[PDB]
Design a protein around this ligand. Structure first.
Ligand SMILES: CCCCCCCC/C=C/CCCCCCCC(=O)O[C@@H](COC(=O)CCCCCCCCCCCCCCC)COP(=O)([O-])OCC[N+](C)(C)C
Ligand SMILES: CCCCCCCC/C=C/CCCCCCCC(=O)O[C@@H](COC(=O)CCCCCCCCCCCCCCC)COP(=O)([O-])OCC[N+](C)(C)C
Ligand SMILES: CCCCCCCC/C=C/CCCCCCCC(=O)O[C@@H](COC(=O)CCCCCCCCCCCCCCC)COP(=O)([O-])OCC[N+](C)(C)C
Ligand SMILES: CCCCCCCC/C=C/CCCCCCCC(=O)O[C@@H](COC(=O)CCCCCCCCCCCCCCC)COP(=O)([O-])OCC[N+](C)(C)C
Ligand SMILES: CCCCCCCC/C=C\CCCCCCCC(=O)O[C@@H](COC(=O)CCCCCCCCCCCCCCC)COP(=O)([O-])OCC[N+](C)(C)C
Ligand SMILES: CCCCCCCC/C=C\CCCCCCCC(=O)O[C@@H](COC(=O)CCCCCCCCCCCCCCC)COP(=O)([O-])OCC[N+](C)(C)C
Ligand SMILES: CCCCCCCC/C=C\CCCCCCCC(=O)O[C@@H](COC(=O)CCCCCCCCCCCCCCC)COP(=O)([O-])OCC[N+](C)(C)C
Ligand SMILES: CCCCCCCC/C=C\CCCCCCCC(=O)O[C@@H](COC(=O)CCCCCCCCCCCCCCC)COP(=O)([O-])OCC[N+](C)(C)C
Ligand SMILES: CCCCCCCC/C=C\CCCCCCCC(=O)O[C@@H](COC(=O)CCCCCCCCCCCCCCC)COP(=O)([O-])OCC[N+](C)(C)C
Ligand SMILES: CCCCCCCC/C=C\CCCCCCCC(=O)O[C@@H](COC(=O)CCCCCCCCCCCCCCC)COP(=O)([O-])OCC[N+](C)(C)C
Ligand SMILES: CCCCCCCC/C=C\CCCCCCCC(=O)O[C@@H](COC(=O)CCCCCCCCCCCCCCC)COP(=O)([O-])OCC[N+](C)(C)C
Ligand SMILES: CCCCCCCC/C=C\CCCCCCCC(=O)O[C@@H](COC(=O)CCCCCCCCCCCCCCC)COP(=O)([O-])OCC[N+](C)(C)C
Ligand code: NA
Ligand code: NA
Ligand code: NA
Lengths: 526, 115, 115, 64
């Protein structure tokens, strides 16, 4: 305070490399101004000392384009690691300014402080901003939550939907759903305006478009199965019924034509969806774009079986059978619409990654290891000239040890072995390692995985259904988006209309007299 | 028994029949006409026969013969091992793990439901 | 302390930082710089690294008598010192050990199978 | 612990001039005529607020 009165510049910028570090262990980014340093290092007395000085530029902006409110979002962390002082510095600076100028300012990559919290995954600052209700009378215009009426326990609130709904570009809802970088997307969609807004989209249009998507893809797999199972099975009856290369005036020939149309509609539409969303990270393919990738492969093999048919290579029938078996396995995508079967498909994804792939690595090491050792111990079968042993090859001994595991066939030890006791020692050692050890430890490890992901399988399901809703919304035309629009215009303040969303509550603990309602008459008027 | 059938067995039987009828058509349409040996060349000749052979494969009865009348014998073996991994390794072992989750919850309440 | 397995005395001695000015030479941890939250420390490596004989690192790894070796290697100078050895030379020698022993099992399998 | 036993056996077999090349640490003037070959670890703490006395360097950057 002595240096301030003596005339030090309160608007200096620290532009060095230490104050803009490349890595987190190199320096300390705080916002480059002495106002941002006092705010980010938990010194509230120097902050309110600086804001009283009339030379203080509170809307200044650094080299990144950040202001004081962008800088507090960047340094925010959890409750456990840091504290909740960043949430209190955000509130104290905002109420001192008194207008919307800090909240609508955009940095160099074009983000407001509200969009920057959702981009980086700051779940505690984002919870504050969306439900911000100010009871004070002159500063009530800075709120985003308004109490419409109240009577006893019952109350009705209004949430502002300005940049959180998908009417503009880069909404809060769009950034959270499509953010492959952060790893807490499924915790940020439980917030109280974002939870109701997805439930309203599912009731009005998304559940009916999800049922029409199911019926077309079911009929596509029926008419692909029937024209492949009921072929003309002769060499004289050579032409294939698909694409209708011979006109015999057959009724319902469009079923051979509906396959070719709908296969090109898929492979074009799935080639675009892969081309736009390109992850280089492997963990984003298996988490977000598995069914985008596997609907495209199934649709290419149907198209490829036609162009390979006209060249008469007689290898088209390999491509159709792969197209049927992959086609009926893709019907497990449509379990998203139900909660009970949708949480069950999240279990299958976590069990294959964590348990089955570790099992199959160690199993093939034992199968191919004991398979060579048994196969090189059998003599030549020219003494009986046929049928002396079933372990004569490497291909035969691997097949016999695989049937031994799943329990098929019969066990014969009267082989053509050079050493018959050594053949039995290696075979019982195989049964102990696989039947007793590995297959029973697989059950014990799956019970460890199920116990952990049962806490999270509901929130992972709601993230997967939320991605379906926002893709149905992008394809329907513009005049449908005006018809299925959520919210209602509300006279919030003097000449302020904000298109808000209404949510009702009941509270039995907090008793208080009601001031700062909007309406006196507490009913549902009209 | 009442809580296990509702929560575990019916979800298992829905996904199992999708895989059984799905791989059953794919294997059955890959077998040729059996008029070269005139009898007994393949046991996957029909849709009714291939569904029966994949059901005996799950409960462990019979014998596994791969010398079929297939047009493509390596493709027939790839689809058959893919069926064993999905049902014998994945679905039947995850059924045991999910029942242990149900038993742990309803053991707190099974006495009061009985009364 | 490392020979007998005294994990609480050993944690004290390795991270010993004395803020007092005349007795600051008795420390084994020094603050190099600091600015706000961020800071940089220096840990002494006199008898804990494997340059001499009977280091603290060598005694803890090879001590068959005690039964808490895996808790004593999480200490803050001993944890980083093993991570630095793995990045510079140990991971490349571990890959060369794998390739020789893999080729040794291939050429033992092939000359025994194809007699 | 099992990977740590692998690291110390690879270190005993490589020759002496390799051990000088792959050496950890750096000489630091700790006090008056005291050099100790120390190891550097960075931290971030958001709870403990205090003014900083008893640093070694005034300039808080990665010098060179
Ligand atoms: C615990 C139980 C489960 C274990 C599972 C692992 C078991 C491993 C399998 C064990 C048995 C398989 C080998 C037996 C050999 C058969 C004989 C044969 O014909 O050999 C042939 C080669 O063999 C192949 O080409 C195999 C083809 C399948 C490859 C592996 C399946 C991939 C599954 C992935 C699916 C992912 C599922 C999705 C997961 C989410 C060659 O025979 P040949 O002598 O050269 O004769 C000439 C050929 N001719 C006759 C045409 C002219
Ligand atoms: C600290 C302890 C560590 C391990 C200790 C060992 C150290 C490492 C040693 C390793 C092997 C040393 C023996 C090498 C030569 C033997 C091979 C041989 O001659 O075949 C013989 C079998 O012999 C076997 O089956 C032995 C197989 C290993 C058993 C080792 C004990 C494992 C304990 C597990 C449980 C006990 C299992 C008992 C065994 C079933 C018999 O041959 P044949 O088929 O009858 O042929 C007829 C002969 N004719 C054709 C010429 C007419
Ligand atoms: C994990 C293991 C378990 C999996 C279970 C699921 C396995 C699924 C089953 C798999 C195998 C069944 C199909 C094999 C076909 C046999 C051949 C056949 O005859 O086909 C026949 C049809 O087939 C039928 O009609 C089947 C009848 C049973 C229906 C399903 C059982 C309901 C169980 C509910 C009980 C609830 C229990 C209560 C629960 C609390 C027709 O054959 P065809 O060619 O037309 O020949 C002409 C007929 N003729 C000869 C008379 C003239
Ligand atoms: C990012 C990664 C995603 C997946 C990558 C692929 C992308 C999607 C691609 C999809 C299919 C592309 C190939 C289509 C045509 C092949 C069919 C064919 O010709 O039959 C062949 C088999 O060929 C197979 O078995 C391939 C089956 C799919 C294996 C794909 C790898 C899965 C990995 C799982 C583990 C590896 C399994 C290895 C395979 C066992 C052989 O035919 P045949 O029976 O010998 O007949 C004799 C020929 N004759 C009759 C004319 C004389
Ligand atoms: C009021 C509520 C509805 C209002 C709006 C409805 C109009 C819609 C307006 C425009 C939609 C344009 C569709 C684009 C075509 C591309 C084809 C395609 O890829 O499949 C698309 C077809 O799924 C649907 O979109 C269903 C809606 C189409 C219905 C068209 C008219 C109905 C005619 C019939 C009248 C029957 C009458 C019966 C009732 C009387 C979507 O594919 P997907 O499944 O999303 O992708 C696969 C999943 N994946 C993400 C993993 C890859
Ligand atoms: C390209 C072919 C692949 C199959 C080949 C096997 C080798 C491939 C290599 C590795 C195997 C795959 C690793 C598993 C990865 C996750 C699986 C999964 O998504 O779980 C799903 C369970 O529903 C299923 O998809 C289970 C069936 C697996 C494929 C079965 C093969 C079908 C037979 C065809 C035979 C011929 C094949 C012809 C072509 C070769 C549901 O999980 P989720 O929670 O919904 O997560 C998805 C996230 N998302 C919804 C937002 C997107
Ligand atoms: C059925 C199985 C049999 C065997 C199948 C074999 C393979 C099985 C494979 C996978 C298993 C999964 C099977 C998928 C079943 C349907 C898909 C689905 O999820 O539906 C969903 C939506 O569907 C509905 O809304 C219900 C139908 C109402 C009428 C819709 C007609 C649309 C036309 C009218 C418009 C004109 C448009 C035309 C002109 C443009 C169900 O959603 P829900 O949960 O019930 O909704 C309640 C949600 N709530 C609880 C949150 C409030
Ligand atoms: C035992 C006495 C004799 C048997 C009865 C006699 C036969 C009865 C005939 C038909 C009854 C079929 C089931 C309907 C009731 C299910 C209730 C349920 O919880 O399912 C759930 C999902 O379950 C699914 O729906 C997934 C798809 C399975 C196919 C059934 C679709 C129903 C359409 C019928 C087509 C007919 C074809 C059927 C062919 C057999 C409902 O979804 P959810 O509610 O959103 O999620 C639950 C979680 N929550 C409650 C908290 C939200
Ligand atoms: C179906 C068969 C065809 C597929 C085969 C293609 C291979 C690659 C296919 C899919 C990619 C697998 C990794 C996915 C991405 C990482 C995420 C993950 O969940 O990793 C998990 C599995 O990771 C493992 O440890 C697997 C070890 C064996 C891999 C090879 C088995 C091949 C099966 C046939 C063998 C013969 C083939 C020869 C192989 C040389 C790590 O498990 P976790 O401990 O729970 O860690 C938590 C997750 N974390 C890492 C994010 C922290
Ligand atoms: C879900 C799964 C996804 C991935 C699928 C995984 C693959 C599935 C697994 C297996 C499928 C393939 C089995 C049969 C192979 C065909 C025959 C062949 O090529 O062998 C030939 C060469 O064989 C040799 O020379 C001896 C073996 C040398 C290497 C030793 C292997 C041990 C590796 C262990 C460590 C590695 C494992 C580490 C962990 C991964 C000999 O052929 P033959 O028997 O003499 O045939 C005679 C008939 N003929 C005369 C007509 C020609
Ligand atoms: C034995 C075979 C004959 C019966 C078949 C008749 C069908 C209908 C029969 C009985 C009615 C089933 C629902 C009961 C009423 C709801 C209560 C409940 O416990 O739901 C549970 C099961 O709900 C499911 O999710 C089942 C999904 C598959 C249903 C169809 C399987 C048919 C089996 C053969 C396949 C071929 C048939 C083709 C089917 C298209 C929900 O599980 P949860 O997650 O623990 O939820 C907690 C409970 N809650 C919902 C109250 C919150
Ligand atoms: C606990 C359980 C309770 C419920 C019970 C459940 C039922 C039990 C399951 C199965 C029992 C029935 C099995 C055999 C059927 C009898 C034969 C038949 O009708 O097929 C005929 C038509 O077949 C075709 O046209 C090809 C198949 C078309 C549809 C593809 C099915 C895949 C659906 C997957 C998704 C749906 C599943 C989604 C999830 C549910 C052909 O018959 P054939 O072989 O040529 O016969 C020749 C002999 N003959 C000449 C004398 C005539
Ligand atoms: Na059996
Ligand atoms: Na049997
Ligand atoms: Na268990």
């Amino acid at each position: 305070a002595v240096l301030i009165a003596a005339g030090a510049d309160v608007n200096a910028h620290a532009k060095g490399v230490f104050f803009n570090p490349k890595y987190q262990h190199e320096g300390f980014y705080f916002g480059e101004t002495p106002l941002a340093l006092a705010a980010c290092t938990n010194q509230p007395e120097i902050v309110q000392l600086l804001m009283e000085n009339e030379q203080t530029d509170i809307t200044s902006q650094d080299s990144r384009g950040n202001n004081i409110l962008h800088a507090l979002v960047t340094v925010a962390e959890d409750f456990k690691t840091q504290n909740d002082f960043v949430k209190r510095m955000y509130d104290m600076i905002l109420l001192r300014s008194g207008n919307w100028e800090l909240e609508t300012m955009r940095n160099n990559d074009g983000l407001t402080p509200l969009q920057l919290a959702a981009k980086m995954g700051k779940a505690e600052i984002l919870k504050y901003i969306l439900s911000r209700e100010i009871k004070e009378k002159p500063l009530r215009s800075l709120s985003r939550k308004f109490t419409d009426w109240a009577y006893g326990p019952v109350s009705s609130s209004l949430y502002d939907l300005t940049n959180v709904d998908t009417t503009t570009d880069n909404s809060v809802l769009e950034i959270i759903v499509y953010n492959t970088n952060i790893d807490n997307r499924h915790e940020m969609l439980t917030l109280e305006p974002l939870h109701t807004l997805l439930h309203t989209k599912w009731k009005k249009f998304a559940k009916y478009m999800f049922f029409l998507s199911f019926c077309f893809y079911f009929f596509y797999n029926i008419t692909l199965t029937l024209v492949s199972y009921y072929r003309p099975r002769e060499d004289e009856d050579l032409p294939h019924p698909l694409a209708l290369t011979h006109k015999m005036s057959w009724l319902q020939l469009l079923g051979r034509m509906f396959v070719l149309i709908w296969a090109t509609c898929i492979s074009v539409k799935e080639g675009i969806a892969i081309f736009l969303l390109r992850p280089s990270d492997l963990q984003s393919i298996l988490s977000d774009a598995w069914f985008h990738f596997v609907f495209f492969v199934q649709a290419v093999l149907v198209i490829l079986s036609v162009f390979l048919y006209l060249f008469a290579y007689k290898e088209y029938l390999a491509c159709l059978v792969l197209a049927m078996a992959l086609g009926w396995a893709n019907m497990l995508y449509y379990t998203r619409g139900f909660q009970s079967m949708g949480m069950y498909s999240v279990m299958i994804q976590k069990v294959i990654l964590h348990d089955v792939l570790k099992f199959l690595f160690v199993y093939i090491l034992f199968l191919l290891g004991f398979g060579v050792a048994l196969a090189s111990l059998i003599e030549k079968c020219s003494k009986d000239k046929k049928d002396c042993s079933s372990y004569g090859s490497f291909s035969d001994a691997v097949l016999e040890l695989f049937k031994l595991t799943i329990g098929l066939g019969d066990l014969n030890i009267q082989q053509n072995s050079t050493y018959p006791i050594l053949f039995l020692f290696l075979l019982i050692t195989y049964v102990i390692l696989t039947f007793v050890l590995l297959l029973n430890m697989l059950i014990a490890l799956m019970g460890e995985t199920v116990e952990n992901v049962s806490k999270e399988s509901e929130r992972i399901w709601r993230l997967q259904r939320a991605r379906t809703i926002l893709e149905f919304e992008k394809m329907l035309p513009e005049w449908l988006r005006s018809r299925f629009r959520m919210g209602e215009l509300c006279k919030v303040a003097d000449e302020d209309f904000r298109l808000c969303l209404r949510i009702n509550e009941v509270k039995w603990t907090e008793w208080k007299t009601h001031v700062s309602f909007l309406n006196e008459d507490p009913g549902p008027i009209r």
